[PDB]
Amino acid sequence: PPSTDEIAKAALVGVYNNTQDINGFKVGDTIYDIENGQPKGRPATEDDVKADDFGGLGLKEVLAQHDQSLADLTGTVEENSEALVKTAEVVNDISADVKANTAAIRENKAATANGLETRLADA
Amino acid sequence: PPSTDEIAKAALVGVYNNTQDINGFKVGDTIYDIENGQPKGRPATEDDVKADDFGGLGLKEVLAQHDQSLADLTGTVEENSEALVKTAEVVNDISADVKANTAAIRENKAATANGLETRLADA
Amino acid sequence: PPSTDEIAKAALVGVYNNTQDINGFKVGDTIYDIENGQPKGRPATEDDVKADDFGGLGLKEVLAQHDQSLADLTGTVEENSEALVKTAEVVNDISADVKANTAAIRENKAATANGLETRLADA
């Protein structure tokens, strides 16, 4: 069987490894495992750091980076939403002016006494 | 050296601390450390909660909040993408009408017997 | 009291559980607890997997999924930002053409000798 002493040491080493998973590690930090039922330390190299799923940052630090990313990205998305509204307002305005002008173009597309005397004269 | 008993107790306390990191803690939860090689508990105060990198939420809960944020933010981004397409369609439509009207404005910008008788008469 | 042996075993089991929280588990993985101060294993069923807050993925894997989501979503948001700029440029262009045409429509909306002789004749 494993003695109480071996169990205890394996638990302590396990705890250390989870603590590095949570809090991160860097070049030169001790990395521990169990060998001959004894804890054995060696220094983390840059290869160990690169082999870690998150480059040794630890879960807490990656989560903090995600908080910053989320807040920043939400800010850009908010700026884009407002730009969309402003653009839609302008476009509707332009849509009214193009129709008013169309109607104007349509509209502007408009294109005895004698016997007595004789007897006397005879004398 | 540290006895088996001290190793075991330090491992148990280490486990408890990682478990609080993962699952969170709140005011009044016991916080444990090792003193004189013995585990020692004290109550978490609001100062301890505030001093934690994630306010005592724990890694699981912060990750759940990130799941909700991601799903919500992706929904807004999806709404913005569709608004963009609808806006582009309308704008292209307007772009066709402004050119048709321009051409119309261009186009509408258009702006013996006698001797015998005598001898007789003599008589 | 709890013996050193019980403390050690409880620490080892605690470590295993945190390690599954961090790294994930799947159907058929051993799940351990403490019973009669002894560690006791049983196989994870699909019910256990479903009962886990993240379906047994583990914190590292959920964080990796969040990295992929963040990078992808940031890419869409970047595409939307550029589409917005291109749309705004086009709209401003159209806004200039609608005003030029308006002014054109306005402008095109334009709509003794005798006594001597007698004495002689008498002879």
From Swiss-Prot, chains A, B, C:
Region (Head domain): 1-110
Coiled-coil regions listed: 59-108
UniProt superkingdom: Bacteria
Uses in industry and biotechnology: Several alleles exist that vary in length, this is allele 5, which is not cross-reactive with all antibodies against alleles 1, 2, or 3.
Subcellular location: Cell surface; Cell outer membrane
Family: Belongs to the autotransporter-2 (AT-2) (TC 1.B.40) family.
Function: An antigenic bacterial cell surface protein that adheres to and induces bacterial uptake by human epithelial cells.
Additional free-text comment from the UniProt record: About 50% of hypervirulent serogroup B N.meningitidis encode this protein.
Domain note: The signal peptide, cleaved at the inner membrane, guides the autotransporter protein to the periplasmic space. Insertion of the C-terminal translocator domain in the outer membrane forms a hydrophilic pore for the translocation of the passenger domain to the bacterial cell surface. The head region (residues 27-137) forms at the top of a long trimeric stalk.
Subunit-level organization: Homotrimer.
Protein's name according to its UniProt entry: Neisseria adhesin A
Upper classification of the organism: Bacteria, Pseudomonadati, Pseudomonadota, Betaproteobacteria, Neisseriales
Whole-protein residues included: 27 to 211 of 325
